[PDB]
Design a protein around this ligand. Structure first.
Ligand code: CLA
Ligand code: CLA
Ligand code: CLA
Ligand code: CLA
Ligand SMILES: CC(C)=CCC/C(C)=C/CC/C(C)=C/CC/C(C)=C/CC/C(C)=C/CC/C(C)=C/CC/C(C)=C/CC/C(C)=C/CC/C(C)=C/CC1=CC(=O)C(C)=C(C)C1=O
Ligand SMILES: CCCCCCCCCCCCCCCCCC(=O)OC[C@H](CO[C@@H]1O[C@H](CO)[C@H](O)[C@H](O)[C@H]1O)OC(=O)CCCCCCCCCCCCCCCCC
Ligand SMILES: CCCCCCCCCCCCCCCCCC(=O)OC[C@H](CO[C@@H]1O[C@H](CO)[C@H](O)[C@H](O)[C@H]1O)OC(=O)CCCCCCCCCCCCCCCCC
Ligand SMILES: CCCCCCCCCCCCCCCC(=O)OC[C@H](CO[C@@H]1O[C@H](CS(=O)(=O)O)[C@@H](O)[C@H](O)[C@H]1O)OC(=O)CCCCCCCCCCCCCCC
Ligand SMILES: CCCCCCCCCCCCCCCC(=O)OC[C@H](CO[C@@H]1O[C@H](CS(=O)(=O)O)[C@@H](O)[C@H](O)[C@H]1O)OC(=O)CCCCCCCCCCCCCCC
Ligand code: HEC
Ligand SMILES: CC1=C(/C=C/C(C)=C/C=C/C(C)=C/C=C/C=C(C)/C=C/C=C(C)/C=C/C2=C(C)CCCC2(C)C)C(C)(C)CCC1
Ligand code: OEX
Ligand SMILES: [Cl-]
Ligand SMILES: [Cl-]
Lengths: 137, 334, 97, 32, 36, 51, 30, 244, 33
């Protein structure tokens, strides 16, 4: 098995456009995801709220939909509750809240797209292990 | 002579059948207190709410245990590290419910065993011996401190101290593996080397000296009668034993110097057990065994399990089941 | 004459749909737009006699009533089971991942 | 506790028979 | 309970003072060779 | 009931046996309750007494 | 009966300790 | 006073309700047009009595005293609810929320431990009609719910539970299940208790009242495995009334 | 038959304990000469 462009092709937006990452953007998104998110989101769960994971099925039923790069980049800029009704920048790291979440300060739009790609690619690789928690370890 | 000096001569007398000594003045009361409390509690104490969740665990023989399952149960998690002497309880009944005997026993015992160690120094001084037997004992002593004192300190509760029982010990070991992966910790691996090697070298030494006993008896009598207590001459031929053992391996892998040989016998198990005691004492602060969980992945990123991942599956079964009613939140952080 | 009431419930609609009277609040994540805002209101407004009573919750926006109508097919109501609703278990039932 | 009733005699004989053997040997050692 | 507490305090105090004073009572000279 | 229980031969100490071991409860059982005083009558209403 | 048995055996061992220490065969130099 | 946490911590006073002066014997006027609240209701038990189980004969059972073994963990506090003025002039307190339960274990002579869920959950307590003032002869009487002492996820020592756990005795694979059913099949009880609250102290200025209570409820039945005991709890209470 | 189960250990000790006593005394008599 290997890391092929079919694996590395994810929805760019909700209108079905796709985009094809490189091995390098995927590895970068992995490192950046470890640096900035994995303290809470290791393996695609959420330690401080396990009801919400990073599975693509879950991301797809979010409002707005988050199973695409632009939806995820927008979430890193201006996060909201699952139903879109509340902005939560105050308690979730985002560019909007980089003053209180310093690790988000040095992040560029290229970084956010890498992180988003990594989140979208990993379930295609790991399947149920991503967002499954310890049952699947 | 004045009373004080007569008392001091008695305390430090080398003619008492059991040496008392100044360390003994504290050792004796504290060991007696702990021993009497332990025996009474093991036979008759009522169930103890170890985990603070109003779920008493029965530890005593009269309440349905046998020798293997019985224990003196650790004090309640609700107490944590608070000091719970008898006089802090409203009643003995309260003190028993919350596991007070465990504190009384372990504190008097740790104090008494520390003085046991000092007493070994003390008699060696009165007899004109070299002083370091007590250093050898420091290895088991430190081990006891780790499981009864240090590990509770780091984890915040005597309820996570080692129980005073046979099955309670096993419980402690299993939970420890789940929360710290002690098998994958090198200080425990060093402890195993210490005790496997200690048993190896114990059997080696006994067998090589026994192999080279000098003929002093007939086939009818015990060969033990060829040694007389106090005899000036050695009862075995160490050159012969060296000659056997050097050829079994090769000449320089064998000891010719009795003093070097016996220091090696002392050093190997003591050092190894120092390390395993230090293992418990540093995993007390959650510096755990090596974690190779999902360390091997393939070209695509599939996880390729190793034996470490299989250990992790067992660990997870221990984790999710232990103290099944005691956790409300998803991480078991102590 | 001795039955596990929780196993019995699995044989009702509770075992198939979100039971507005019983089900833990985390189940409303299954369908779009219900969590957290509407799920909180549904749980707080407590037991309902019929599924459609959920549309009469004081304060819904027109948007919220629409989302709710879109999801009525995913709801049911059965009788309140004490063992499921005591202990604050509709908000946290001891299950994480 | 619903223990095995033969446990008592098994334990008693387990202790008694070997112990008596040793005592017999020791006492007749002392008297010569 | 107060009575138990006082009694232990006194017992403990007594044995600790014995230990302290005993070792202060010239302990280095209590050996079989050099009486200092 | 305590007085009635004395008036019962099962508590008479001369009703035992040498090798009938253990407590009295092992024989007739653990007394739970007095059933009441039994009064016997024949068909002519006369009161009769058990010897 | 099983509690009595366990305590009995333990009590014998404590007694054995007493005799083993105070009524040992004394070691003699010779 | 402005006692701070650091003044109180570890003394046992955190489990005590506030008290009122012996001179607080006034009356709190109740204005029927107005709507009232209990901003804080505190109940501090001082004695737990358990009804004895008399043998067969059907002689009388008394409430016998017991020894508390779970320490200063017993008080209910920060309870709040609406104080309703009813049309007959009675007052009704309807609990909304608060720290309104404490598990308690007491011990009977002979060593039997009795756990119970000391509680006034969903308390509804009412005065007599036509109460124009709360005074030092005002009484409230009410009832409350007593849920199972363990809730549905609780696992017994062999791993059996209601909402989780084994459904059988797995250590006895081929035993007859019929004699084990009461232990295997867990049940969640909901019962009612009754409480009297007797106002003995009233600061008409501040709206604080205090007094004694007596409660009756059932103890733990271990999710159906044994019969509960009847328990009578006595103690003291404090409340603060604020216009709402 | 429903016999007293303690009758076994009673009988066993009734035989064993006195018998062992006599054997102990006999064997130490023989080894005196
Ligand atoms: C060598 C003797 C010895 C020692 C060192 C200990 C040590 C201890 N005992 Mg044990 N004990 C002993 C003998 C001893 N015991 C005996 C013989 C009995 C039978 C009566 C007991 C019965 C006993 C009980 C029943 C309990 C203990 C407990 C304790 C612990 C705390 C003691 C404490 O707070 O004292 C504090 C004392 C000091 C700090 C004094 C230190 C010395 C300074 C220098 C002088 C200060 C003077 C003092 C404050 C005032 C004088 C008295 C005044 C009130 C008139 C500790 C492990 C408790 C325990 O294990 O808790 C879990 C407990 O519950 N002990
Ligand atoms: C099949 C045989 C076998 C062998 C070879 C080993 C070997 C080892 N085990 Mg394992 N072990 C075994 C069976 C075996 N085990 C079994 C059956 C069990 C029970 C199920 C265990 C349970 C166990 C545990 C729980 C642990 C070990 C550990 C160890 C290590 C230390 C052993 C030690 O010091 O022993 C004492 C023996 C000596 C001190 C004598 C010397 C032994 C060394 C290793 C030989 C050196 C040869 C030398 C390099 C050759 C030189 C050639 C020339 C230049 C002269 C070592 C790798 C520890 C470990 O994993 O360490 C990482 C550890 O934690 N073992
Ligand atoms: C073959 C496999 C194997 C082997 C060889 C070992 C070997 C060891 N393990 Mg590991 N372990 C294993 C598998 C294994 N383990 C597994 C599978 C698990 C996971 C379930 C663990 C989990 C584990 C834990 C959690 C711990 C160990 C510890 C230890 C050590 C125990 C001995 C000790 O502490 O001595 C040291 C000596 C003592 C503790 C004795 C103290 C004696 C005091 C001072 C005096 C006592 C006096 C007494 C009461 C009076 C007697 C009087 C009488 C004469 C009348 C030893 C190095 C322990 C350790 O390292 O502790 C430091 C420990 O805590 N193991
Ligand atoms: C004065 C002595 C005395 C008395 C009156 C009692 C009385 C009692 N005991 Mg107690 N007991 C005693 C001493 C005594 N005990 C002693 C010393 C012990 C330690 C062994 C016990 C241990 C004990 C236990 C463990 C129990 C009792 C119980 C009881 C009750 C039932 C007794 C029973 O079934 O007897 C039965 C008596 C017999 C079957 C008679 C034995 C006849 C002997 C064996 C004849 C031997 C003849 C000899 C071999 C001939 C050789 C002579 C020649 C040829 C050389 C009763 C109230 C029981 C009870 O209910 O407790 C709550 C119970 O469970 N007792
Ligand atoms: C393929 C071929 C070779 C086939 C052809 C067949 C053929 C004829 C072969 C011959 C040719 C030949 C030799 C070929 C080479 C092949 C070869 C190298 C084989 C490799 C085999 C191999 C694995 C070797 C075994 C490894 C081995 C056991 C090494 C252990 C190393 C080591 C020294 C361990 C012991 C550690 C140690 C020294 C502990 C001391 C123990 C101790 C404290 C003892 C106590 C004690 C000691 C005393 O000392 C005395 C005094 C007394 C009192 C006493 O208490
Ligand atoms: C010391 C060494 C001991 C080892 C030698 C032991 C030899 C055994 C001794 C024979 C015992 C015979 C008892 C058999 C009965 C038994 O098995 O049941 C065992 C019974 C107990 O009875 C049990 O009780 C139980 C509830 O407690 C249940 O009811 C059981 O069903 C019932 O069997 O034991 C006795 O009660 C023993 C105590 C008897 C003491 C009475 C002494 C008074 C009689 C005076 C005798 C003087 C005569 C002198 C002769 C001259
Ligand atoms: C060398 C031999 C050493 C033996 C050690 C034995 C320790 C014995 C301690 C027993 C208490 C003795 C003092 C009696 C005073 C009345 C209290 C009593 O009845 O309690 C002894 C009992 C023990 O507790 C009960 O033990 C019973 C044994 O059959 C049952 O099994 C009960 O179920 C179990 O709960 O508890 C109470 O009564 C608590 C008292 C209620 C509140 C009163 C507060 C005052 C208590 C003062 C007691 C302090 C004593 C501390 C002991 C220190 C030991 C050095
Ligand atoms: C378990 C109980 C142990 C003590 C606890 C106290 C509870 C009540 C006991 C009251 C009676 C005390 C008598 C003690 C008998 C004795 O030891 O004689 C032994 C010798 C003989 O006395 C010596 O003999 C000579 C004179 S004479 O024989 O005493 O007449 C002379 O050399 C010298 O003056 C004299 O000291 O005395 C000594 O050696 C002094 C020290 C002995 C004390 C050791 C106590 C050990 C306790 C620690 C155990 C902890 C748990 C152990 C569990 C396995
Ligand atoms: C880049 C850093 C490099 C770090 C190197 C490591 C640091 C330590 C350096 C060496 C330490 C000193 C040598 C060893 C000890 C010593 O000197 O004793 C002095 C004697 C001197 O040897 C004896 O030497 C004698 C001459 S004399 O004593 O030196 O004068 C002679 O009489 C006799 O025949 C001979 O046996 O040494 C020995 O007895 C040899 C025994 C084997 C080595 C013992 C070390 C202790 C074993 C520890 C292993 C425990 C591991 C834990 C397992 C769980
Ligand atoms: C590193 C920059 C990241 C990224 C890329 C994400 N998180 Fe978090 N996350 C946390 C919590 C508590 C929630 C739920 C909040 C709520 O809705 O109430 C989330 C949620 C998300 C999502 C949405 C997932 C979904 O299914 O809708 C996403 C895409 C996401 N996060 C990405 C908690 C944390 C943290 C704890 C402090 C940390 C750090 C992060 N998140 C970091 C990141
Ligand atoms: C003087 C002196 C001496 C001696 C000393 C001694 C000898 C002491 C002893 C001491 C002692 C001898 C101690 C003891 C203690 C004890 C204790 C402290 C115990 C406790 C116990 C308890 C508390 C219990 C309880 C219980 C239980 C657990 C269960 C059941 C119930 C009851 C309640 C019973 C010497 C030589 C050193 C020298 C100097 C001087
Ligand atoms: O107590 Mn005994 O054990 Ca150490 O972690 Mn947390 O806590 Mn409990 O859990 Mn896992
Ligand atoms: Cl556990
Ligand atoms: Cl928790």
């Amino acid at each position: 098995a290997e890391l092929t462009p079919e694996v590395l092709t994810v929805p760019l937006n909700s209108e079905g456009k796709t985009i094809t990452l490189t091995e390098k953007q995927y590895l970068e998104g992995k490192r950046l995801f470890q640096y900035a998110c994995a303290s809470c989101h290791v393996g695609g769960i959420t330690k401080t709220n396990p009801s919400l994971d990073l599975r693509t099925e879950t991301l797809a039923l979010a409002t707005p939909p988050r199973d695409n790069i632009e939806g995820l980049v927008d979430y890193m800029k201006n996060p909201t509750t699952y139903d879109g009704e509340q902005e939560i920048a105050e308690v979730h790291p985002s560019l909007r809240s980089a003053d209180i979440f310093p690790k988000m300060r040095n992040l560029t739009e290229k970084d956010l797209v890498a992180i988003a790609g990594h989140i979208l690619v990993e379930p295609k690789i790991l399947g149920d292990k991503w967002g499954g928690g310890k049952v699947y370890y | 002579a004045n009373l004080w000096e007569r008392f001091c001569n008695w305390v430090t007398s080398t003619d008492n059948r059991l040496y008392v000594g100044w360390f003994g003045v504290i050792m004796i009361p504290t060991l007696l207190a702990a021993t009497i409390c332990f025996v009474i509690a093991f036979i008759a104490a009522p169930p103890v709410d170890i985990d603070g969740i109003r779920e008493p665990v029965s530890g005593s023989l009269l309440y349905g245990n046998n020798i293997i399952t019985g224990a003196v149960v650790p004090s309640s998690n609700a107490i944590g590290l608070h000091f719970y002497p008898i006089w802090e309880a409203a009643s003995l009944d309260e003190w028993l419910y919350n596991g007070g005997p465990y504190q009384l026993i372990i504190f008097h015992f740790l104090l008494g065993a520390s003085c046991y160690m000092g007493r070994q120094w003390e008699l060696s001084y009165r007899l004109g011996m070299r002083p370091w037997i007590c250093v050898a004992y420091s290895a088991p002593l430190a081990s006891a401190f780790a499981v009864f004192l240090i590990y509770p300190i780091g984890q915040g509760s005597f309820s996570d101290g080692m129980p005073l029982g046979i099955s309670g010990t096993f419980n402690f070991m299993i939970v420890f593996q789940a929360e710290h992966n002690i098998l994958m910790h090198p200080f425990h691996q060093l402890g195993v080397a210490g005790v496997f090697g200690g048993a190896l070298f114990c059997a080696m030494h006994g067998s090589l000296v026994t192999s080279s006993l000098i003929r002093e008896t007939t086939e009818t009598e015990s060969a033990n009668y060829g040694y007389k207590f106090g005899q000036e001459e050695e009862t075995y031929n160490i050159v012969a034993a060296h000659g056997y053992f050097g050829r079994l391996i090769f000449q320089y892998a064998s000891f010719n110097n009795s003093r070097s040989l016996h220091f090696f016998l002392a050093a190997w198990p003591v050092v190894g057990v120092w390390f395993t005691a230090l293992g418990i004492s540093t995993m007390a602060f959650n510096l755990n065994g090596f974690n190779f969980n999902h360390s091997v992945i393939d070209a695509k990123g599939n996880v390729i399990n190793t034996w470490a991942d299989i250990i992790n599956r067992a660990n997870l079964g221990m984790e999710v089941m232990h103290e099944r009613n005691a956790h409300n939140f998803p991480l078991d952080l102590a | 004459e001795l039955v596990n009431v929780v196993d019995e419930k699995l044989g009702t609609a509770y075992g198939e749909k979100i039971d507005l009277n019983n089900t833990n609040i985390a189940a409303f994540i299954q369908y779009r737009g219900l969590y957290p805002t509407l799920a909180k209101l549904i749980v707080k407004n407590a037991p309902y006699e019929s599924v459609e009573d959920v549309l009469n919750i004081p304060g819904l926006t027109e948007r919220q009533k629409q989302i709710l109508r879109e999801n009525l097919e995913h709801f049911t109501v059965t009788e309140v089971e004490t063992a499921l609703v005591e202990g604050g278990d509709r908000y946290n039932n001891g299950l994480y991942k | 506790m619903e223990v095995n009733q033969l446990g008592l005699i098994a334990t008693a004989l387990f202790v008694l028979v070997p112990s008596v053997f040793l005592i017999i040997l020791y006492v007749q050692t002392e008297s010569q | 309970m107060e009575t138990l507490k006082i009694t232990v305090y006194i017992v403990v105090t007594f044995f600790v003072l014995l230990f302290v004073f005993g070792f202060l009572s010239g302990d280095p000279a209590r050996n079989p060779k050099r009486k200092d | 009931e305590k007085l009635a229980f004395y008036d019962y031969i099962g508590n008479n100490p001369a009703k035992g046996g040498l090798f009938r071991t253990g407590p009295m409860n092992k024989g007739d059982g653990i007394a739970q309750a007095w059933k009441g005083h039994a009064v016997f009558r024949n068909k002519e209403g006369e009161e009769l007494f058990v010897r | 009966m099983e509690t009595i048995t366990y305590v009995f055996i333990f009590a014998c061992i404590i007694a054995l300790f007493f005799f083993a220490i105070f009524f040992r065969e004394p070691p003699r130099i010779t | 006073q402005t006692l701070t946490y650091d003044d109180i911590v570890g003394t046992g006073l955190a489990n005590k309700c506030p008290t009122l002066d012996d001179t607080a014997r006034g009356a709190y006027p109740i204005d029927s047009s107005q709507t009232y609240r209990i901003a804080r209701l505190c109940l501090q038990p001082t004695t737990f009595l358990v009804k004895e189980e008399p043998k067969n004969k059907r002689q009388e059972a008394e409430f016998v005293p017991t020894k508390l073994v779970t320490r200063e963990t017993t008080s209910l506090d920060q309870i709040q609810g609406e104080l309703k003025v009813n049309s007959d002039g009675s007052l009704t307190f309807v609990e909304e929320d608060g720290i309104d339960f404490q598990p308690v274990t007491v011990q009977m002579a002979g060593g039997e431990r009795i756990p119970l869920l000391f509680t006034v959950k969903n308390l509804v307590a009412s005065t007599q009609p036509n109460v124009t003032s709360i005074t030092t002869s005002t009484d409230f009487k009410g009832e409350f719910n007593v849920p199972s002492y363990r809730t549905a996820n609780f696992l017994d020592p062999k791993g059996r539970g209601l909402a989780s756990g084994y459904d059988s005795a797995i250590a006895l694979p081929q035993a007859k299940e019929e004699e084990l059913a009461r232990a295997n099949v867990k049940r969640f009880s909901l019962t009612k208790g009754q409480i009297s609250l007797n106002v003995a102290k009233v600061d008409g200025r501040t709206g604080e009242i205090a007094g004694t209570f007596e409660s009756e409820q059932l103890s733990d039945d271990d999710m159906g495995a044994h019969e509960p005991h009847e328990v009578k709890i006595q103690g003291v209470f404090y409340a603060s009334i604020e216009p709402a």
